[PDB]
Amino acid sequence: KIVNIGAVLSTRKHEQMFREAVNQANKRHGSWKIQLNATSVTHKPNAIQMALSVCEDLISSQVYAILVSHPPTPNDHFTPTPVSYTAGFYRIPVLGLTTRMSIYSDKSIHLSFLRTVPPYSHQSSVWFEMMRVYNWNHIILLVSDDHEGRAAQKRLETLLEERESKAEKVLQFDPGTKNVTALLMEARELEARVIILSASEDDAATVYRAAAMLNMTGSGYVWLVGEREISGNALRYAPDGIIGLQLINGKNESAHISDAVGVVAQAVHELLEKENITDPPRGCVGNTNIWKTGPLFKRVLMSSKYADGVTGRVEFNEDGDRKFANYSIMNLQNRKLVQVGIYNGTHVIPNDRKIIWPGGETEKPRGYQMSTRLKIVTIHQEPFVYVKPTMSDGTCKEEFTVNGDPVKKVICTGPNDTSPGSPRHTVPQCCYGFCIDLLIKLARTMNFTYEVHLVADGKFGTQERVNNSNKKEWNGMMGELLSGQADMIVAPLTINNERAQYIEFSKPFKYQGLTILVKKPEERITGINDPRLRNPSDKFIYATVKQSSVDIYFRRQVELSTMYRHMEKHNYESAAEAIQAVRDNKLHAFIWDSAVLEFEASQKCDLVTTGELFFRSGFGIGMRKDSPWKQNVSLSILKSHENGFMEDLDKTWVRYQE
């Protein structure tokens, strides 16, 4: 007829308040014959013998609830873990009250741990409420604590599942280092300014000093931190105008103890109304039998619904967290904490105080500034991308064409040869041609600067297994684009269904098919329907560029596996290698686009194309995902389609013959 409650509490005044709450718990519950005893223990500066003393004292006491209520501990470990593990050996609920670590959220590790405080990842949902208010989509994540970093990434993907957007940059590294400013500058070069930080006080002060020295706290830079990042020297190193969070009664222990007493008391009076009552045995000596109503009492604690307390509607979810939590939103106005918002369990309301930002006006700074210098990457296409070495030092010889058109070149940067050939030789040379004039037309239509560089290899990019952990990766232009080093691929991109699933496409500027390059008895082949090419031999030598989209289009064709097995022994690096090889009469056929070989037939009369025209497709501009550089650029491309500028580009290279 007795119920024992164990507690690890230090101060005698709060012990007296705890005993007073135990005494007042039996007030409104009638004259029932249940009794409530409480046993509180102090704290030795160690942790092993503390765990020993507490575990054998609570075995000898046979308690039902175990409480740890020590915020101001000098050790920064904050580990009530061993007593919770010892109670989880017999499945006894330990109600943690102080820490908010995400390692306690794993119920597979902490089998019988409950708590009335949520982890900080729920604050990101509050920050998602910022996304419900300030209408901001692209974020920049920075988490140093990797024990909670996977849970923060999980919660972030759970929040972004609704809008189906993507985080622009995520970062995880070892806490303790200092040279993280390179990734800060890489995030600075991005369009967004939203900064989400999840670390301890030392790394927060380190990144505050790094933003202060590099002036990343100017206009438009969105800063959004929590309670751990506004304490200690991080509060001293914080810039003025930063927005932070505050836990209402997060450190106020006296009402929190009474709330915990009310929760435990109503849980015990709920459990007394049901059958199958079991008791914890004397597990110190000769008792390893588990307490059989562990998950039963846990299920009692799952449906615990309350209506008493100064905090309010305390309620457990499936994770045993805190529902309907009042939060405060603070601002740092001239090294002074100024309250600028309140938060109920679903909605943010700013108070009568104004919101003064570190940049300009008091309204929200739209920190989504698009890149005025679009990084352009391309492959060396032979009739389209002419690359010429410089004359004296980084210069371009301004030669004139035969039609009175001056060639407007650009200073591009490119490697010299392949990686076994050239170890490291990347020089700036002169790029011009077809798509360069297309980019000149785009820069004439819309005012934006650019940065033309070249892809490191001579491949488009295929979907290949990386050599560890069985993961798909891309390479080439797609590998340089998806890594964030490139912005817009201006190249004759072969449009297919696979790449449409991953990135968005624009309107095609080129429209052509496929053809066969031969040299001039049947000297022609007339397409794929030659039966000798269905079952080839060592005579008809035909191949294509290694890691090309033509090979992917043939890989989708499940009835031409013989050509896929035949052409893999003769794939070349570039198409010019195939031109030189068939120039020496070593090749016999080559599947390639139409107008390139038409221009090369206009250059060299021995180069002969075939008669058929299959795979009538289009080539456009390689693009990113949903972006404001899509609609206006596509309208500019269609404006180039409707006028005679396509005919002008034909007059430059296509219509011009010899």
Partner 1 sequence: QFGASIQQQATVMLKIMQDYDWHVFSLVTTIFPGYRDFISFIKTTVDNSFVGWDMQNVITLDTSFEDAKTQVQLKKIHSSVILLYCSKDEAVLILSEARSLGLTGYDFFWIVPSLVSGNTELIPKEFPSGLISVSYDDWDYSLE
Q: C-beta of 171: minimal distance to partner 1 in Å? A: 19
How many Å apart are CA 516 and CA 578, to the nearest integer? 12
Can you tell me which of 77, 150, 274, 556 binds partner 1, judged by CB under 8 A? 150
Stretch that binds partner 1, among 3-11, 171-179, 463-471, 645-653 (CB under 8 A): 463-471
Query: Three-state SS string across 287-315, please?
Result: CCCCCCCHHHHHHHHHCCECCCCCCCCCE
Count of residues engaged in binding partner 1, rule: CB under 8 A:
14
Instruction: Name the minimum Å distance from CB 106 to partner 1.
Output: 6
Q: Is 108 in the site for partner 1 (CB under 8 A)?
A: yes
145 known ligand binder: no
Task: Kindly indicate which of the ranges 383-391, 465-473, 620-628, 636-644 contains the residues binding partner 1, using the contact rule CB under 8 A.
Answer: 465-473
Rounded to whole angstroms, the Cα distance separating 390 from 413 reads 11
Q: 549: annotated binding-site residue?
A: yes
SS3 281: coil
Q: Is 318 in the site for partner 1 (CB under 8 A)?
A: yes
Residue 565 engages partner 1 in binding (rule: CB under 8 A) = no
| 113 versus 619: smaller Cβ distance to partner 1 | 113
Determine if 568 is a binding residue for partner 1 (CB under 8 A).
Answer: no
Under DSSP, is residue 325 helix (H, G, I), strand (E, B) or coil? coil
Nearer to partner 1, 318 or 559 (CB): 318
**How many other C-beta atoms can be found within 10 angstroms of the C-beta atom of residue 220?**
15
At 196, give phi and psi (nearest 5°): -110, 125
Residue 147 lies near partner 1 (rule: CB under 8 A): no
Query: Among residues 68, 61, 69, 114, which one has the least CA distance to residue 91?
Result: 114
**At CB < 8 A and 24+ separation, what contacts does 293-301 make?**
294/90, 294/91, 294/92, 294/112, 295/91, 297/91, 297/93, 297/271, 298/91, 298/93, 298/112, 300/267, 300/270, 300/271, 300/274, 301/93, 301/114, 301/267
Report the nearest approach of partner 1 to the CB of residue 265 (Å): 24
Q: Tell me which H or E stretch contains 632.
A: helix 631-642
**Residue 494 in marked binding region:** yes
Q: Which neighbouring-strand residues pair with 172?
A: 143
Contact indicator for 371, 191 with CB cutoff of 8 Å: yes
Residue 282 labeled ligand binder: no
Nearest distance in Å: CB 617, partner 1? 23
Site string for partner 1, 597-636 (x = CB under 8 A): ----------------------------------------
Q: How far is the CB of 154 from partner 1 (least distance, A)?
A: 6
To partner 1, the closest distance from the beta carbon of 259 in angstroms equals: 25
Q: Which of 64, 112, 62 is nearest to 84 (CA)?
A: 112
Which residues have a Cβ under 8 Å from the Cβ of 307 and sit 6 or more positions away?
313
Between CA 411 and CA 430 the distance in angstroms is 5
Which of 27, 28, 471, 569 forms a contact with partner 1 (CB under 8 A)?
Answer: 471
Could you tell me how many helices (H) and strands (E) the chain has, helices first? Answer: 20, 26
Catalogue the E-assigned strands of 71-176.
Answer: 94-96, 113-115, 140-143
492 belongs to an annotated ligand binding site: yes
Return the range that interacts with partner 1 (CB under 8 A); candidates 470-478, 550-558, 591-599, 613-621: 470-478
From the list 214, 272, 302, 391, which residue makes contact with partner 1 (rule: CB under 8 A)?
302
Q: How far apart are CA 475 and CA 459, in angstroms?
A: 8
Member of 12, 13, 472, 520 binding partner 1 (CB under 8 A):
472
Other Cβ atoms within 10 Å of 428 Cβ, number: 14
Binding mask 329-348 for partner 1 (x = CB under 8 A): --------------------
Stretch of residues binding partner 1 (CB under 8 A), selected from 173-181, 323-331, 339-347, 464-472:
464-472
Among 44, 77, 154, 366, binds partner 1 (CB under 8 A): 154
Binding site residues, partner 1, CB under 8 A: 106-108, 150, 154, 157, 295, 302, 318, 465, 469-472
